Amino acid sequence: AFTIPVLKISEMTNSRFPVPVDQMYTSRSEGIVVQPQNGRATIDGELLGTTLVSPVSVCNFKGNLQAEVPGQHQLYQLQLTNLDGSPIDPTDDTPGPLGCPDFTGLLYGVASQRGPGDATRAHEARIDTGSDTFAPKIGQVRFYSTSSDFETNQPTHFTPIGIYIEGNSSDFNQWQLPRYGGHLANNNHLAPAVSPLFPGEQILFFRSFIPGASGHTNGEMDCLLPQEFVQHFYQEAATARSEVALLRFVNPDTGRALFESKLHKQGFMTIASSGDHPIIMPTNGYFRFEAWVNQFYSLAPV
Amino acid sequence: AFTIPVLKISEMTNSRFPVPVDQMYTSRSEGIVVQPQNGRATIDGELLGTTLVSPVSVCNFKGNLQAEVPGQHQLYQLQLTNLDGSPIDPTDDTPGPLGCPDFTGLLYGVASQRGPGDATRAHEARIDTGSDTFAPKIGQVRFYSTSSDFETNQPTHFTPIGIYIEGNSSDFNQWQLPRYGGHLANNNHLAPAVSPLFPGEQILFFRSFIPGASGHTNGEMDCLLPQEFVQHFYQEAATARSEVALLRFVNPDTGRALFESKLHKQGFMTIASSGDHPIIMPTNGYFRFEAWVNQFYSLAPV
Ligand SMILES: CC(=O)N[C@@H]1[C@@H](O[C@@H]2O[C@@H](C)[C@@H](O)[C@@H](O)[C@@H]2O)[C@H](O[C@@H]2O[C@H](CO)[C@H](O)[C@H](O)[C@H]2O[C@@H]2O[C@@H](C)[C@@H](O)[C@@H](O)[C@@H]2O)[C@@H](CO)O[C@@H]1O
Ligand SMILES: CC(=O)N[C@@H]1[C@@H](O[C@@H]2O[C@@H](C)[C@@H](O)[C@@H](O)[C@@H]2O)[C@H](O[C@@H]2O[C@H](CO)[C@H](O)[C@H](O)[C@H]2O[C@@H]2O[C@@H](C)[C@@H](O)[C@@H](O)[C@@H]2O)[C@@H](CO)O[C@@H]1O
Numbered sequence A, B: 001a002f003t004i005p006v007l008k009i010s011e012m013t014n015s016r017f018p019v020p021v022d023q024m025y026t027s028r029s030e031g032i033v034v035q036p037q038n039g040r041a042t043i044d045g046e047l048l049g050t051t052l053v054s055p056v057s058v059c060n061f062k063g064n065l066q067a068e069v070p071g072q073h074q075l076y077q078l079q080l081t082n083l084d085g086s087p088i089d090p091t092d093d094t095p096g097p098l099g100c101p102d103f104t105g106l107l108y109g110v111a112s113q114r115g116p117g118d119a120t121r122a123h124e125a126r127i128d129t130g131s132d133t134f135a136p137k138i139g140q141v142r143f144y145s146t147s148s149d150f151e152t153n154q155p156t157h158f159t160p161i162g163i164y165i166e167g168n169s170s171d172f173n174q175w176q177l178p179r180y181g182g183h184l185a186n187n188n189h190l191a192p193a194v195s196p197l198f199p200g201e202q203i204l205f206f207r208s209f210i211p212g213a214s215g216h217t218n219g220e221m222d223c224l225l226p227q228e229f230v231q232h233f234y235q236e237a238a239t240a241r242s243e244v245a246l247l248r249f250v251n252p253d254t255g256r257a258l259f260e261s262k263l264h265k266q267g268f269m270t271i272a273s274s275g276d277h278p279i280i281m282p283t284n285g286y287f288r289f290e291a292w293v294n295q296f297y298s299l300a301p302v
Helices: A227-236 B227-236
Strands: A023-027 A061-068 A075-081 A106-114 A120-128 A140-145 A155-164 A201-209 A212-214 A220-223 A244-251 A256-264 A268-272 A277-279 A286-293 B023-026 B061-068 B075-081 B106-114 B120-128 B140-144 B155-164 B201-209 B212-214 B220-223 B244-250 B257-264 B268-272 B277-279 B286-293
Touching (some): A075 A155, A106 B155, A120 B120, A155 B106, A155 B155, A212 B106, A256 A286, B257 B286
Parallel strands (some): A120 B212, A155 A212, A212 B120
Antiparallel strands (some): A023 A201, A023 A277, A075 A140, A106 A155, A120 A140, A201 A220, A201 A268, A244 A256, A256 A268, B023 B201, B061 B075, B061 B155, B120 B140, B201 B268, B244 B286, B257 B268
16 A cells, blocks of 8 residues: 655655755756756655755765865865765766766865764865866866865765855856766766656646845755655565645645645656745645545646 | 565664654663653654654754844854744643654754845754743744844744854754753653663664764764654554564565564563673664563564
8 A cells, every 4th residue: 555654845845955845846947957866766765866855964074084186275185975874986887976966066064074084074065066186986086175284094974965066157056967077088877867748737846945145045945755755665665556646735723635736656746836926824734645546637727 | 464564774763853763772771861852652643742743853953034133243043933833832732832842962963044025044053952042932933143244023933954063062962852842841742751661672773873063973863763664653653552563674675584672562572681782783674573471571682
């Protein structure tokens, strides 16, 4: 029996950045390819892209502080491990290491170290996921920091915080996939792009406004499934009885349905709507499974 | 029926700090009162203390940047809201706001703002959860920052990163509860201290090594239940058929089991062990629910 966990929008976690979901949101996505690599799981529990189940790991990095890069002030070279400590293995059937950012921008966070012994230090750091030498697929990532207080050959962790806007082309683009293998290699093993195929339908996104560390940005980060759904599908591994799980968003306060959504087998939701806008609903509302239908099922407008 | 999710230790999230669990750990906890307020839930789904379900929210704060504290350089007064945006209500049946830190120390992180408009800024911040002024229960919390780039009367978020060790009395003590009401107040609505009551048993902890930002610290943070168990019990609300759920740590690699543990109804686990030490197990190992036993069920040592 297929189920969805009972969660208010305000209890959901974004699957593309480690923060709560702020609102549901829908868009025409005009002139945009929606192909996020985090928050990708089929409803029968297969993880795609760089998707992992830990809800606090996405956009984090871990590894050895190999050296300060020659000829650049306080730019530091990491030799990544996987976030669980296992070594990076570029033969993996993934675009890059699990949890790797799936967007281009100036990722702002903090680089911390423990070592030698139990000595520690941390400072503000920035990773440009759009730069030529950003190549997490093979464990090669650099971070800039304003501090020189870092030890070489000590275990180092990058904790993501938000985006840093300089006001340029290096500006946060949530839909532009990074080149996981650096400027000299092409991406492989990507989770496929998704789009609404039925007329009058749009994708339903779970949107957070991630912190901004500089410049003007609303920090919009849209995921196709909250992390809790990813986790649940992975746990249940229930077999999809059809291409579409029909869901009802219900308001427990009144006992009635607010709208319907098509949860597609491959792990995204559509609703009947038009335009770019938030979907603001009674705080207590939640999705529940109604029935298995086909991809041609017709939804009533949200 | 009662279940627990299938999770490797490395897939678990600490329920007292938003980072993955690093290892299982057990201790005599000699002359220590084990009374964490985060990651507290009964196995039938009742959340206790300051425990919330979101796995990315613990140790975060949200609030208005009221002003800079007079006569003190770059110390800033927050007027907290709840993490959900609602006003702080000191009459809540909680020791303090959900997700509030449950230890005393120099909590290191980043304070960010968005406003006016979509202008943003973020800088390192430290909050001393042990200072007299720390009074989250009534929404009064201060943070120190090395930057003066903060706007008064703009929405402010504190994202936790780790602990800052000055090497003095304000040093991290994971088992010392803060005075949630501030220096002139006694705590209330506390989740109870826990201990092994059966001879030969000790509590099984889920330990993380949280980042240190300065000084010497192992950053040891022990929780009674991974956040995933908290979330599961909350979702399931299954009736506890006895006082103790018997769990077995199984190794899927071999099909053989390694040890058993008693999951007590009030939300902590014990094992038959003696001494302070990590419990290292094959990395693919996980807990499985076996039976409903009582508090006198006798376990083979680990
Ligand atoms: C970290 C840092 O110092 N960054 C600055 C940046 O200021 C930051 O962001 C602005 C918007 C504000 O929130 C500051 O508190 C914050 O530190 C600078 O941006 C300009 O900041 C000044 C600050 O007085 C004005 O607010 C100005 O309007 C900002 O310019 C805008 O944002 C820039 C990033 C550009 O996009 C520009 O076209 C915008 O008008 C910038 C430039 O001075 O420098 C660092 O990035
Ligand atoms: C952030 C910061 O600058 N804090 C310093 C702190 O240095 C930090 O901690 C040490 C252990 C090391 O990891 C540094 O890289 C890190 O920035 C200072 O601590 C001293 O630092 C020097 C190195 O610059 C030595 O390592 C020295 O042993 C450190 O003192 C020890 O740690 C202190 C926290 C005290 O407990 C002291 O008794 C220890 O001997 C301190 C003191 O200089 O000042 C800032 O806080």
